[PDB]
Amino acid sequence: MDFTKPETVLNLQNIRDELVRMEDSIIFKFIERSHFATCPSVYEANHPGLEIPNFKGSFLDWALSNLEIAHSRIRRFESPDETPFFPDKIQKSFLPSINYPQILAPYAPEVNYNDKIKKVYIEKIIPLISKRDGDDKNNFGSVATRDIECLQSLSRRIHFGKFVAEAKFQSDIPLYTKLIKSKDVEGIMKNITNSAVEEKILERLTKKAEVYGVRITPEYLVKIYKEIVIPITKEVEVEYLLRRL
């Protein structure tokens, strides 16, 4: 797959493979973060305790923004692959700009979920995967980096659902146009996902978790994933598809 070649992106088996790569990650990112306590202070807004000059926003926010700025000068946020959490602060690169051919529909950028992702990460995911609850002041830096990477993995995967949904639409125009025209959510819902194949994916994902690393059993993790992360993946697909005509 290459984002400079539409045909290679819209290819179903290719995306199929890409996801396997971007879904295994989120799982590896979670297993990493699961070695630290909850560290509420790392998220409490306005960074209570850290003397950050006029910064307003959690410690996590400062760190993530700070690291997104550093990562941008090397073209990280120019690929249709990446969507930053702080667009208003990412710098430009001293490397040549790459011509990425249009693949998705124009409105595509309007379909952004970043703020939702971080909200479920911090409120719903963290409490479940932490080693324990409480601030671990000697690891605020380690923990913060972990979140930034778990946020980065959740985003890229979730937002890749526009390509996943665009490839699908185009794989069967006649079918989707009808579903879309009748604003039939559930119709769309059942055609972009096969229970038979989704489960085998999760069965594979569980096996990876165990062999990788790991209080949190492999199967329990895959369910945290299946029940809090998956639903958001599909919200991007149906939103995109509905306004596709």
Ligand X SMILES: N[C@@H](Cc1ccc(O)cc1)C(=O)O
The residues annotated as belonging to the active site are 16, 157, 168, 194, 198, 233, 237
- According to CB under 8 A, which one of 11, 22, 44, 71 is a site residue for a copy of itself? 71
The beta-carbon contacts of 4-9 under 8 Å, at least 24 apart in sequence, are 4/98, 4/99, 4/100, 4/101, 5/101, 6/101, 6/103, 9/103, 9/163, 9/167
The smaller minimum CB distance to ligand X, of residues 89 and 124, is found at: 89
63 binds a copy of itself (CB under 8 A): yes
The span from the CA of 39 to the CA of 75, in Å, is 32
67 binds a copy of itself (CB under 8 A): yes
71 binds ligand X (CB under 6 A): yes
We find the least distance from the C-beta atom of residue 60 to a copy of itself, in angstroms, to be 11
Structure tokens at 48: 């209570």
Cα-only R_g, the chain: 19
73 binds ligand X (CB under 6 A): no
217 binds ligand X (CB under 6 A): no
201 binds a copy of itself (CB under 8 A): no
Binding characters for a copy of itself, 98-127, by CB under 8 A (x = yes): x-----------------------------
35 binds ligand X (CB under 6 A): no
Q: What DSSP character marks residue 79?
A: S
The span from the CA of 169 to the CA of 55, in Å, is 44
CA distances, 53 to each of 47, 57, 69, 136, 179 (Å): 11, 11, 18, 23, 52
- According to CB under 8 A, which one of 74, 128, 185, 245 is a site residue for a copy of itself? 74
Partner whose binding site includes residue 101, from a copy of itself, ligand X, none (CB under 5 to 8 Å by kind): none
Question: Mutual orientation of helices 140-159 and 161-171 as an angle, nearest 10°?
Answer: 10
Residue numbers of the site for a copy of itself (CB under 8 A)?
A: 2, 4, 21, 24, 50-52, 63, 66-67, 69-71, 73-76, 93-96, 98, 137-138, 140-141, 144-145, 207-208, 211-213
